[PDB]
Design a protein around this ligand. Structure first.
Ligand code: NI
Length: 341
């Protein structure tokens, strides 16, 4: 059954609630972003209104074949009315098209549901600065102090230099990058840009990326593997067996693979700096695990909540265990006591 943290009090609304059949009482389904845990359930046969960003709209139309009449795309940073309720979509600094939703309830309450997000200080100067927020439905994926990780800028620096170095030393070397959902495009796009190649991918993934309103994207991507020396693969195929295999498919055009796995957090972050990361190497194949996150670090999250000063916090990730729930309320109370709200 639809859980309580996917319903919006005093509205006919749910968020990211497509895997529970018809929800008793819902007049509008919101979808924060196109990642399968959140869209799970949607298909061409869905006949209720869905609300979302223009980019999430393009993917529902083209990848899930949802009928155009049930897709209601909204512009960001703009006050719109949905079944008599003022709402605003804001950028979530997660994957392309990913949004936060502000709900202005008829009774005077104000609610912010973050979807998935990576908190930034730039958010402190959106339409969020203009008014109080009473409830915050918060992406809590990394709500624990051991969760540190570097900036996206630092990580893209690392990958660029690494890639450019290896290829200038050995021009017959192939760069491979893993993927399974949208998001983190900057990794492979930045490597291809410094190398002067487009990014070879499967047709299904070229179709995915074509839906994203990226600037000049035609110039950056291709389905022609042979012309390209930066290749996308499934994240499943990024291991020694899968790379030796793919290497053979290229027909003696390359002798060395340098591959990147963008992970979220990994326990080498508690000890190691980004500058000191090393690969796993078996012969002519090396694999880099890089901590590119599109989710708030503990500090980034902490900062955002203490600036927002909400009256109630309702977690949306790591809610399935009592130890987790308990631990998260402990940090919330600390943040509150430390900041005085
Ligand atoms: Ni997500």
């Amino acid at each position: 059954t639809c859980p309580f943290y996917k319903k919006i009090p005093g509205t006919g609304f749910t968020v990211d609630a497509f895997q529970y059949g018809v929800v008793e009482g819902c007049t509008a389904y919101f979808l924060t972003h196109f990642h399968s845990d959140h869209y799970a359930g949607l298909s061409k046969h869905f006949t209720f209104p869905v609300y979302c960003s223009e980019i999430t709209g393009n993917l529902l139309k083209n990848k899930l074949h949802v009928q155009e009449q049930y897709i209601h795309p909204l512009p960001l940073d703009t006050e719109c009315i949905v079944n008599g309720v003022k709402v605003v979509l804001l950028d979530a600094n997660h994957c392309p098209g990913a949004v936060m939703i502000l709900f202005y309830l008829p009774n005077g309450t104000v609610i912010l549901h973050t979807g998935d997000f990576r908190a930034d200080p730039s958010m402190e100067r959106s339409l969020l600065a203009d008014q109080k927020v009473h409830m915050l439905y918060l992406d809590t994926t990394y709500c624990s102090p051991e969760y540190t990780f570097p900036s996206q800028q630092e990580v893209i620096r690392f990958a660029i230099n690494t890639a450019f170095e290896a290829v200038t030393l050995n021009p017959h070397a192939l760069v491979v990058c893993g993927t399974y959902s949208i998001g983190k495009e900057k990794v492979f796009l930045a490597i291809a840009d410094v190398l002067g190649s487009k990014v070879g991918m499967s047709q299904e993934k070229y179709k995915t990326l074509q839906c994203l309103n990226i600037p000049e994207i035609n110039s950056l991507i291709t389905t022609d593997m042979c012309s390209s020396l930066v290749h996308l693969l499934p994240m499943m195929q990024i291991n020694f067996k899968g790379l030796q295999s793919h290497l053979k498919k290229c027909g003696g055009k390359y002798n060395q693979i340098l591959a990147f796995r963008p992970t979220g957090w990994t326990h080498s972050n508690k000890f190691t700096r980004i500058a000191d990361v090393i690969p796993q190497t078996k012969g002519n194949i090396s694999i880099y695990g890089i901590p590119y996150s599109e989710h708030s670090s503990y500090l980034e999250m902490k900062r955002f909540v203490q600036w927002l000063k909400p009256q109630k916090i309702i977690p949306t990730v790591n809610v399935g265990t009592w130890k987790s729930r308990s631990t998260m309320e402990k940090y919330f109370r600390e943040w509150k006591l430390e900041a005085g709200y």
